[PDB]
Design a protein around this nucleic acid. Structure first.
Ligand SMILES: [Mg+2]
Ligand SMILES: [Mg+2]
Ligand SMILES: [Mg+2]
Ligand SMILES: [Mg+2]
Ligand SMILES: [Mg+2]
Ligand SMILES: [Mg+2]
Ligand SMILES: [Mg+2]
Ligand SMILES: [Mg+2]
Ligand SMILES: [Mg+2]
Ligand SMILES: [Mg+2]
Ligand SMILES: [Mg+2]
Ligand SMILES: [Mg+2]
Ligand SMILES: [Mg+2]
Ligand SMILES: [Mg+2]
Ligand SMILES: [Mg+2]
Ligand SMILES: [Zn+2]
Ligand SMILES: [Zn+2]
Lengths: 176, 63, 85, 162, 169, 222, 97, 38, 43
RNA sequence: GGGUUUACGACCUCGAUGUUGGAUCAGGACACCCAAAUGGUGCAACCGCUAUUAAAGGUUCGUUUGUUCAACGAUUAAAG
């Protein structure tokens, strides 16, 4: 039938949308796919998302190809934040060191993309740096002793003020 | 949803739910069924508010 | 159906000590930070800031023409914004 | 000229291309330095729909026109020659430049009305029932306006709308 | 009587109509049309940085490496293209793609004029140091409709049969 | 294969504050109480003011004469504000607010009795005057595309021109008026009073040179 | 390639293009090969075998299509255009099969 | 068919053809894009 | 059928009678005569 | 663009161009209500809504009102 891309959680493979109707229209069952995915990713920490490609054949059979997790997840973990920044460039979400970037690149090099592409780690580090720039996470050369926490305190205060301002704007739009 | 059967929740006003079992069955070939219960109140949209106000005025006669 | 709950257990210290998100499998084994005597120099010999400019690149290398093609695509996209089809 | 031939011998189809001899340009043109065929053979503003000996040089055996990138005419001369070939085909010249339909040649129809200098197509023009008054008169177009630059030996302009 | 400024174009007096018709503009018309007149001399086009870079790269490729194989660039899926690229970089052989508009003049100016019938359609330049055609033909045999056009092995132009013979040698 | 041409880069242009078009009032802050005559000379003839660019690079040129009222002003303002990019483009007016009072009379009134009552205000526009002038770090293709609509919806014929297109059309008009072939020109005949043509001509034709007729302007008339 | 992909080539077994790339009349045959060996033509049917025979002294470029109706379309293309060969092959495939 | 004074292609699959002396915007995917120049 | 409103050559809507080549030639001839006149009236 | 309504003008008639509605007979235009051939639809079907072409033929009977109109009753393929 064709190939389907899906970013699925490690062990949280539910038989509902946004993956149920697609596979159902393709013809493949959903419970079989969820079982196979859970048995294939049971060794993975339940919760982290990873892209996978499902090749559905004309005889209603399917094969699964699982790769490395999402770079956004890798960066959020390495920075210690739950959600990225809204206004990229104007605000800073986290702080990741080139060491952490190199480790992320080394763990991610063994995927479909960077396997089909014989490319050294330099370009993968560049891709990770670009992804971090898009997420809004700064990459300092060598700065992590306690100033990471010094910036984390200001970031938490900024997030609190942002939540209060968002609630105030919602209340204003409600009473207007 | 579970399997070949999706379950979609929504918050629809009661004034807009009249005659919905004849439309849902029409678009689902008689296979779709729905259940609804009163949830909460909210400020009505200006169009239906103007509609019910004009209805009240025409009921009490004078404009 | 959300992200991993483990996120910066001890943010002031653990994040500086090493990265915890590199470990993917359920068996918790975090890798050491591998101090600066391990990674090669190309890691630090790359731009970690804003990108370069077309008025700063020299028109005899390939990245100059790559950025010029990017700018040409941008200009074509800006011009084709009035597609009435 | 190249010809495509097909050979069927027991559920085996053979498609072949055969190149035959073609006539070339005459050796002595009057204006060799001209880039265009017509404008170098000095036929510019000289031909018409009657000059079939010139209009039939570049057309397909089924009456179709030939591409400009293959012929070499300048755009205006190409458009003029296209309109002249259309007018000749409508007037009845070039009768052997039509497809041979042995099944359709038997059911004869109404006799062909004689015409010449026909601008539009006979199956697309509607009859002018009002015809207008003297101040607003619905004139009938005759010939093409692309041939308005031809040499006029009498000096009078060609009446393209009458 | 209408005003001096109206909306109905205010049809003029007959004398003014005649004056307008007489004073109408007449454009200058030359004796001979300049379109397919003998054209002006050639406006020599100047070389740019892109074509200079391409010429320099092609010269460096033809000067430095030894095995220069010419293959037909087949339109396959990019995933299979990346797979062949991986299999090529495994044996340390690379593939290049150059525009014909910059490759044909360089080829006919250099000593590789005998490769002209090879560089008309889509092209793939297999470039490698230490020519090892055995593994190359081994990995090209897996794909049936990717035909080896030809190439040169240390200033020796060979066809597909020549490449097969050099591999078996 | 095609060559890679460089792209135009705009850095010297500065987007001012409030780049959108300002709101125009239907009636001036002080209404004209005294009723004025409808001088049609403010439409007749070529425009003398607002004929050149001030700070922008594109504009809406009026190839004819007419009146602009609050409906036209609101149309232009709304269309330009909703179709422009306030981060890279700015627009400004070149015609004043409606100031000329227009009188009207009720239906069923016979002729005479005096002047009517002021109904609305208009802005006189002559041929060759700019209406809206735009600038910024944008090209002309998109601006022309979204300004042709306003130029068409304007009463008089209008075009979306730029500096280059305006200079090009003016130089083309000069070239035509200088390489004209026939020796007889409207200007020459009217200035010399040949054939006694001043009897049918107008005293303003000596300056209009046959290019302006009432409120209309023919740019191909030398 | 698109005209072939929108044709349903599932009813063809083998297509072999035998040519010599060192000639002066193999342009049409090379483009025919590249059009019949495109990715869409590959994915519309995987049972087909597309062979590209490269010789040096054959001097007669040609194409041979054997399809499962027991049919054999043989076209010795020395002067035909690629477009004409494409249209002929497509019309024959849609006529038989 | 809609009889209009100014024809314009409403999608990339509309084709403009001259038939019976008029211009026609024909569309095979969206038949509601059928326009006829009056 | 095609009526001219009002009088033929008076109102806002008149007869659209065009200018002919004969009238153009006559005007050009008169202009040439007047040009020769204003030349002879120069010195 | 047309000249159906009201108005504007006051050009032909004041040694007369008799003024609303109806009865009889209707001529014509199409900007088609029906009947006919089609296109698009958010056209499933029955009903519809628009647009194109076509004017040879039709376009009801009653209560109230002087009424043209208007409301209402029963129909028609329609009650232009
Ligand atoms: Mg690149
Ligand atoms: Mg007057
Ligand atoms: Mg207008
Ligand atoms: Mg009259
Ligand atoms: Mg009149
Ligand atoms: Mg009347
Ligand atoms: Mg009036
Ligand atoms: Mg009177
Ligand atoms: Mg009077
Ligand atoms: Mg009277
Ligand atoms: Mg009498
Ligand atoms: Mg009648
Ligand atoms: Mg009609
Ligand atoms: Mg009907
Ligand atoms: Mg009738
Ligand atoms: Zn020519
Ligand atoms: Zn369309």
């Amino acid at each position: 039938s064709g190939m389907i891309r899906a970013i699925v959680r490690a062990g949280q493979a539910r038989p509902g949308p946004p993956l149920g109707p697609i596979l159902g229209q393709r013809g493949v069952s959903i419970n079989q796919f969820c079982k196979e995915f859970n048995e294939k990713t049971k060794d993975i920490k339940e919760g982290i998302p990873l892209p996978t490609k499902i090749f559905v054949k004309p005889d209603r059979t399917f094969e699964i190809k699982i790769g490395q997790p999402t770079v956004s997840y890798f960066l959020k973990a390495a920075a210690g934040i739950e959600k990225g920044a809204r206004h990229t460039g104007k605000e800073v979400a986290g702080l990741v060191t080139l060491k952490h970037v190199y480790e992320i690149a080394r763990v991610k090099a063994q995927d479909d993309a960077f396997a089909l592409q014989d490319v050294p780690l330099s370009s993968v580090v560049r891709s990770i740096i670009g992804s971090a720039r898009s997420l809004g996470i700064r990459v300092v050369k060598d700065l992590s002793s306690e100033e990471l926490a010094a910036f984390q305190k200001e970031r938490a205060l900024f997030l609190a003020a942002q939540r209060e301002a968002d609630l105030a704007a919602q209340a204003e739009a409600a009473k207007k | 949803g579970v399997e070949d059967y999706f379950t979609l929740y929504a918050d629809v006003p009661l004034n807009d739910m009249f005659g919905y079992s004849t439309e849902l069955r029409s678009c689902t070939e008689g296979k779709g069924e729905y259940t609804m219960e009163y949830s909460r109140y909210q400020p009505c949209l200006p169009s239906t508010q103007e509609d019910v106000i004009n209805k009240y005025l025409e009921a009490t006669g004078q404009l | 159906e959300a992200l991993k709950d483990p996120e910066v257990c001890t943010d002031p210290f653990r994040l500086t000590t090493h990265a915890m998100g590199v470990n993917i499998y359920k068996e918790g084994q975090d890798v050491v930070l591998k101090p600066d005597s391990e990674y090669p120099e190309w890691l630090f010999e790359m731009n970690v800031g804003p990108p370069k400019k077309l008025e700063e690149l020299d028109p005899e290398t390939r990245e100059y023409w790559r950025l010029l093609r990017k700018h040409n695509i941008w200009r074509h996209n800006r011009l084709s914004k009035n597609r009435k089809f | 000229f190249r010809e495509v031939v097909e050979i069927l011998d027991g559920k085996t189809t053979i498609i072949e291309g055969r190149i035959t001899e073609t006539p070339q340009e005459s050796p002595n043109p009057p204006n060799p330095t001209g880039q265009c065929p017509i404008c170098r053979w000095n036929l510019k503003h000289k031909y018409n729909y009657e000059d079939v000996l010139l209009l039939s040089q570049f057309i397909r055996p089924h009456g179709g026109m030939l591409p400009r990138r293959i012929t070499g005419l300048c755009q205006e001369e190409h458009l003029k020659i296209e309109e002249c070939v259309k007018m000749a085909h409508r007037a009845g010249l070039l009768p052997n430049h039509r497809p041979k339909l042995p099944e359709g040649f038997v059911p004869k129809s109404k006799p062909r009305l004689n015409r010449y200098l026909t601008r539009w197509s006979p199956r697309s023009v509607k009859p002018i029932y009002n015809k207008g008054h003297r101040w607003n008169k619905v004139r009938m177009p005759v010939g093409s306006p692309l041939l308005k630059d031809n040499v006029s030996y009498s000096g009078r302009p060609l009446l393209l709308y009458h | 009587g209408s005003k001096a400024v109206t909306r109905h174009r205010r049809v003029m007096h007959f004398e003014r109509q005649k004056l307008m018709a007489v004073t109408e503009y007449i454009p200058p018309k030359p004796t001979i049309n300049p379109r397919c007149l003998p054209p002006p001399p050639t406006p020599p086009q100047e070389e740019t940085g892109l074509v200079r870079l391409l010429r320099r790269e092609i010269a460096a490729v033809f000067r430095d490496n030894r095995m220069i194989a010419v293959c037909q660039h087949v339109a396959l899926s990019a995933e299979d293209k990346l797979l062949l690229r991986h299999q090529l970089r495994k044996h340390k052989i690379l593939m290049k793609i150059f525009p014909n508009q910059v490759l044909k003049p360089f080829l006919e100016e250099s000593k590789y004029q005998n490769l002209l019938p090879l560089f008309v359609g889509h092209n793939l330049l297999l470039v490698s140091e230490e020519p090892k055609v055995k593994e190359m033909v081994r990995i090209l045999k897996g794909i049936p409709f990717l035909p080896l056009l030809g190439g040169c092995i240390d200033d020796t132009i060979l066809s597909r049969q020549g490449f097969i013979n050099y591999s078996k040698l | 294969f095609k060559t890679l041409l460089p792209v135009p880069t705009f850095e010297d242009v500065a987007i001012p504050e409030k780049p959108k078009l300002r709101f125009v009032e239907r009636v001036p802050l002080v209404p004209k109480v005294r009723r004025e005559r409808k001088n049609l000379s403010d439409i007749r003839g070529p425009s003398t003011e607002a004929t050149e660019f001030t700070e922008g690079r594109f504009a809406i040129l009026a190839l004819g004469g007419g009146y602009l009222h609050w409906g036209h002003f609101e149309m232009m303002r709304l269309t330009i504000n909703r179709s422009m990019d306030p981060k890279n483009m700015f627009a400004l007016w070149r015609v004043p607010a409606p100031f000329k009072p227009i009188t009207r009379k009720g239906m069923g009134q016979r002729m005479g009795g005096g002047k009517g009552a002021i109904d609305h205000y208009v802005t006189p526009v002559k041929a060759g005057r700019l209406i809206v002038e735009m600038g910024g770090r944008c090209e002309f293709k998109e601006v022309q595309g979204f300004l042709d609509l306003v130029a068409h919806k304007l009463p008089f014929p209008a075009k979306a021109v730029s500096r280059e297109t305006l200079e090009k059309m003016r130089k083309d008009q000069e070239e035509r008026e200088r390489n004209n072939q026939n020796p007889w020109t409207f200007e020459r005949i009217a200035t010399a009073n040949m054939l006694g043509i001043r009897k049918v001509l107008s005293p303003y034709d000596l300056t209009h040179k046959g290019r302006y007729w009432g409120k209309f302007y023919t740019p191909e008339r030398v | 390639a698109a005209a072939l992909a929108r044709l349903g080539l599932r009813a063809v077994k083998q297509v072999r293009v035998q040519f010599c790339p060192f000639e002066k009349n193999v342009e049409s045959t090379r483009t025919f090969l590249q059009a019949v060996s495109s990715e869409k033509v590959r994915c519309t049917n995987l049972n087909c075998s597309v062979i590209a025979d490269v010789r040096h002294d054959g001097s007669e470029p040609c194409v041979d299509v054997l399809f499962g109706d027991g049919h054999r379309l043989i076209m010795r293309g020395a002067h035909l255009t690629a477009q004409e060969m494409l249209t002929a092959f497509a019309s024959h495939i849609q006529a038989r099969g | 068919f809609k009889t209009k004074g100014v024809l314009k292609k409403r999608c990339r699959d509309c084709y403009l053809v001259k038939r019976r002396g008029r211009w026609f915007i024909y569309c095979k995917t969206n038949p509601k894009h059928k326009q006829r120049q009056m | 059928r095609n009526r001219i409103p009002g009088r033929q050559w008076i109102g806002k809507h008149r007869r659209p009678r065009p200018v002919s080549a004969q009238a153009k030639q006559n005007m050009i001839r008169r202009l040439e005569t007047e040009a020769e006149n204003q030349y002879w009236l120069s010195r």
